Structure 1
Amino acid sequence: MLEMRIGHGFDVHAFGGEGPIIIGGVRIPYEKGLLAHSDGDVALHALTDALLGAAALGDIGKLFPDTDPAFKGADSRELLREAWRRIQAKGYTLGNVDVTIIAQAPKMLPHIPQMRVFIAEDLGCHMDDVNVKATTTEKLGFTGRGEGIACEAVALLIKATK
């Protein structure tokens, strides 16, 4: 008995105050920062949700409530590793993941290798199983007007029974 499972995640955060932003674990210089209870790290959030979705464990909002102040300013990589620990406790292993950052700016391409390192590390997998890409929406929408950043992820999990 070998089971394969598909998952999908989507997240948005608004720009706010200032600092760098944090995306896929990488600190990226930018005129403004991300408003969140959190890292605001939309890439890891969308990814975490894709993983929980494939395991039918719900999503980050269920596992890590807005209400609990133990998650205020939390490293989104902590959340990813925690979510992943539980996924593994139900007997799943990683097939592969693919992430799509939707942002007008800043440039994501230079930071993609480092994101993959962080993600592969956090998921205890080889980098070959992690893909991250970016698209701009050509000045259209809330993304295109520089009001915020959106991100999607899909994930494939494997489970042996065997």
Structure 2
Amino acid sequence: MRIGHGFDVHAFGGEGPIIIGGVRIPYEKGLLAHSDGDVALHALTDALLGAAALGDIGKLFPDTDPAFKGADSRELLREAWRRIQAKGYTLGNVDVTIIAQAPKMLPHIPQMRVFIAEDLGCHMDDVNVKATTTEKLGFTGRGEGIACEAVALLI
């Protein structure tokens, strides 16, 4: 059993929607990023790479490499997962916590769990996603951006 932890942040910028956990969520503003800025999947990817001792998302897929521009975070998720499995690991379970004042993540979580479980080739029960606001405090409370944390357990 191996434990991992990931954390990510992306700033709001431009027009909506935003992509979180693979879900296109309607919002007044979008998120600024090289890729699709999916904070939830970056934090998850890092948690999994962390538990595998493979480093982090930026070590494997550089901000500098042009191909990663506009990149689908689920692709990165699946690749990191491919490499993790090849190192001999299997999924224990993952838990994600989206820290955002808005939009409301609640209704999109079921679909998120479907995408993530698909990507990790596991059952939805091994995947949990949740959300919380920082009750108007901070860059998140001010609507400046979204953050996300995640933990993973590999076997």
TM-score w.r.t. the length of structure 1 is: 0.95
User: After superposition, what is the alpha-carbon deviation per residue over 1:10-43, rounded to whole angstroms, capped at 9, x for unaligned?
Assistant: 0000000012000000000000000000110000
SS in 2 for 1:16: coil
- How far apart in 1 are the matches of 2:64 and 2:148? 23
- How far apart in 2 are the matches of 1:151 and 1:31? 19
User: After superposition, what is the alpha-carbon deviation per residue over 1:40-60, rounded to whole angstroms, capped at 9, x for unaligned?
Assistant: 000000000000000000000
- How far apart in 1 are the matches of 2:30 and 2:124? 28
Number of corresponding residues: 155
Identity of aligned residues (%): 100
User: After superposition, what is the alpha-carbon deviation per residue over 1:125-154, rounded to whole angstroms, capped at 9, x for unaligned?
Assistant: 000000000000000000000000000000
- How far apart in 2 are the matches of 1:118 and 1:77? 8
- How far apart in 1 are the matches of 2:63 and 2:20? 20
**1:67 shift after superposition:** 0.8
SS in 1 for 2:90: strand
SS in 2 for 1:104: coil
- How far apart in 2 are the matches of 1:56 and 1:18? 37
SS in 1 for 2:50: helix
SS in 1 for 2:12: strand
- How far apart in 2 are the matches of 1:36 and 1:151? 15
- How far apart in 1 are the matches of 2:15 and 2:75? 23
Structure of larger gyration radius: 1
- How far apart in 2 are the matches of 1:19 and 1:142? 18
User: After superposition, what is the alpha-carbon deviation per residue over 1:67-103, rounded to whole angstroms, capped at 9, x for unaligned?
Assistant: 1001000000000000000000001000000000000
SS in 2 for 1:77: helix
- Listed as ranges, the gaps of 5+ residues in structure 1 are none
Matched, 1:6 2:7: no
Runs of 4+ with >3 A deviation? none
- How far apart in 2 are the matches of 1:124 and 1:11? 23
Matched, 1:29 2:26: yes
- How far apart in 2 are the matches of 1:81 and 1:126? 15
Matched, 1:78 2:75: yes
- How far apart in 2 are the matches of 1:125 and 1:27? 22
- Listed as ranges, the gaps of 5+ residues in structure 2 are none
